[PDB]
Design a protein around this ligand. Structure first.
Ligand SMILES: [Ca+2]
Ligand SMILES: [Ca+2]
Lengths: 219, 219, 219, 219
């Protein structure tokens, strides 16, 4: 039966049928948003949902026999596995993000339609070039986050109280989001010199970020 | 009579006369802004305004006898038709926005003068080389918007209570506009881990946007 | 005496004596900032000021005989002229920005030193290859600023009440400064669809602004 | 004994031992953040600290014999000296920032690992080609910072009261951080024309900054 299924799975109709399902479960998920819609068609949607989930595991099962090892060395395939697997944990127990993480299957429209794959791959491929910088920065954030925690977290614990909090705040300053009126001006009412910590921080982090982008507009 | 009017329409004087009317009507519309000016010279204005609208329909009528089907295959011509069209719907009934949409005719200055046409066309021309990415993002926004609506819309309905609102709020975070003190910090007072949703959201969306820009610094 | 002075003006000493004065008057102007310093050495620096103002007029006079018509066709010279002229208008009368515009002379350090001149000129020269774009944008701002005034000015006059106000607010949205929580969200409490005006406005304006930057990276 | 140690220092083991210490002290410094961890194992980590600081000075001592004048002409080497030196200054007296500045030693992970050194060097190397522009801006900031102090510092001393504050505030406008609702709109409630100072300021400073990035995508 091997070549029978290898001709079912690999068939245009099979793929195009999967894609047709994604776009339907996709649409169906944007409807599960309406409290109104659930009070009229809630049952329709939960069933339709459970259905598609089977169809996708059947498919993923079929897909595996036709590929075996070759499959668990395909990024795109692994993805579909894990995404469907997430969708498999029952509508219960554990955390509830799993019920929410289900909507990740709409990312299959990327995986199971070229052009997306291409563009996605075009994007991801840039990442290796950045890891030298990214590393540098994370060391930097780690260093400043520590300094910040022990300079400001006594009077300003919301913002710098914990190593993690400083990380968050520092990230915020880096996105330049409300950094002066929101954060540094307050700090200064107590620690006049706080500007000496944040202006340099901003220069460095924005400098690095400009290089990093110019780096990507060459490779 | 055709070649008579073809010579009239194609005549530089005709074009330049149109362009002259635009720069007059534009100035007129900026004066229609002043409550003072309208009490003084509102009469002068509304008639000069209606006059121009006639002239522009006559022109557009003339312009079609001289181009026929070639016209409705011209972007710029279509534009002008559709723009003057808007301005034709009476100063009453339906949606008061129409009366306001009238000012779109000042975009005829773009259409009736080249170099503008050049620059605009230069701009537009970049779009198709972006649609692979734009689509990618929209799928992303769509996925996260749904996730957010079901993660935060109960305690935070202004911001996430609805698919639309999540779209809006998500866009706002993307523009990095007041995203931390304005939104995530609040969110966190209830959902400590909301940073796990938004920091990734921010990296991705910002990354994509950098690639999209560099993509245009190649083509 | 012509060639005598033509040898004084062109003299490296003279030029370097000018640059020396600038850096002093510059230093002197940052000292004039302190209320304390003025209560000690105010009279010192006021005279020192009037002194330098003469020296600079003497020079610009000498500079003219030596160059005549050639001088009033030099950007950098015209500048130096006008910036000294401002510094000549009596310490009284009219507007008091003239007392404040006097600090523009420190821009002579840009004029009187190359590399600065190089860099300034390098910058400026990019401008003509932007005017096509700048025009487009200004037309756009003018169009939207009009729409906005007659759509939100009635309920929201601080922000859109006047053509100028809308220009201002629009600029602010363009810099993406506090635009959603600060403006569009309030707007929406009254005009639910105001998002329809501002999201597009942002796309256009930021798209256009990105192209304009990529233009300056191929020129 | 010279060549004996020149084979100790210049050994793989040595370097990799140093790197191993950094990553350990680094982890130790993130644990010193927790008030909990300090009430438990504070003693462990305070000793561990003095230990590493010894090892590092011994190493730096060794490193100098093996290198002499070649060492105090290596950026990276000088760094480690200075950084370790700061870490030597007793746990008392003067200012406490010295105690905090100690965490700068984690920058040795950059000093003492290539690729980092490469990437950092890549970045720093870009700087000299910016000094022409940077200079320009600092003159510009200085000129406007002075202007602002005398136009707004009387009614608005938090923001422009002192030369320094104006620098700070102006910097903030440059990052476009809450500049309109936070600063200019208020300023305008008293000085209607303040927009005539800040909008130009913003174009110039943003324009320049755009070029400066385009420069770094050519050099
Ligand atoms: Ca803000
Ligand atoms: Ca902001």
């Amino acid at each position: 039966m091997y070549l029978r299924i290898t001709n079912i799975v690999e068939s245009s109709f099979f793929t195009k049928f999967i894609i047709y399902l994604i776009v339907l479960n996709g649409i169906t998920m944007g409807l599960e948003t309406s409290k109104t819609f659930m009070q009229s068609f809630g049952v329709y949607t939960t069933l339709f949902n459970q259905i598609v989930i089977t169809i996708f595991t059947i498919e993923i099962i079929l897909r595996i026999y036709v590929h075996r090892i070759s499959f668990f060395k395909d990024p795109w395939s692994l993805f579909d596995f894990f995404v469907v697997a997430i969708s498999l944990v029952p509508t219960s127990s554990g955390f509830e993000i799993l019920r929410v993480l289900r909507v990740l299957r709409l990312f299959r429209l990327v995986t199971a339609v070229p052009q997306m794959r291409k563009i996605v791959s075009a994007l991801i491929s840039v990442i290796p070039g950045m890891l030298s910088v990214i590393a540098l920065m994370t060391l930097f954030f780690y260093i400043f986050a520590i300094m910040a925690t022990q300079l400001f977290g006594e009077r300003f614990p919301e913002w710098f109280g914990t190593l993690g909090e400083s990380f968050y705040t520092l990230f915020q300053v880096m996105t330049l989001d409300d950094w002066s009126n929101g954060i540094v001006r307050p700090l200064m009412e107590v620690y006049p010199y706080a500007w000496v910590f944040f202006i340099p921080f901003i220069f460095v982090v924005t400098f690095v970020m400009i290089n990093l982008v110019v780096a990507i507009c060459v490779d």
